[PDB]
């Protein structure tokens, strides 16, 4: 039947990365979540008129298990590389995440999107022009998202699915 896309979220810990998938998969309109529930990470969606199933791997909280990253990344067809717009270190980490994905997938052209996440009201330290320039240097889209209002969340995942479809 319908195509299933295996997406993997990667990025620094401790800066709200998990809000991206929670807000997507959530009952959009009730703020509640049980991640232990069978298929709290699967969602059927319609993108450009084509129905598909998203299976999202987000291992948020396991960042210290650094030798497991290869195993987790190997499962994915497309990747969201997430940093926090108020944490410059998480932005500087993006280069090494992308290099690791390319190595695990043994490809120089892996479907991926760069996501800048607004996780609180603390002062932004990564300007949108900096992130756009980085994304353009890689040849990938850039999407900004809010961890509180759900803005940009659908755009981030749907843009990634379009990258997979057009690979």
């Amino acid at each position: 039947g319908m195509t299933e896309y295996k997406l993997v979220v990667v990025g620094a810990g401790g800066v709200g990365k998990s809000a991206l998938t929670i807000q997507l998969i959530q009952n959009h309109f009730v703020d509640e979540y049980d991640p232990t529930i069978e298929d709290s990470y699967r969602k059927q969606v319609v993108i450009d008129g084509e129905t598909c199933l998203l299976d999202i791997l987000d291992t948020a909280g396991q960042e210290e298990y650094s030798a497991m990253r290869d195993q987790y990344m190997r499962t994915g067809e497309g990747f969201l590389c997430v940093f926090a717009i108020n944490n410059t270190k998480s932005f500087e980490d993006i280069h090494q995440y992308r290099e690791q994905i390319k190595r695990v997938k043994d490809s120089d052209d892996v479907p991926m999107v760069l996501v800048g996440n607004k996780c609180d009201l603390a002062a932004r330290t990564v300007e949108s022009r900096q992130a756009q320039d980085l994304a353009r240097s890689y040849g990938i889209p850039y999407i900004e998202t809010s961890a509180k209002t759900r803005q940009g969340v659908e755009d981030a995942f749907y843009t990634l699915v379009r990258e997979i479809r057009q690979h």
Partner: peptide
């Protein structure tokens, strides 16, 4: 332990 960590983190982050 990693599964427990992810489930605690997401329970905290996903509920008011």
């Amino acid at each position: 332990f990693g599964i427990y960590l992810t489930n605690i983190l997401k329970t905290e982050e996903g509920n008011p």
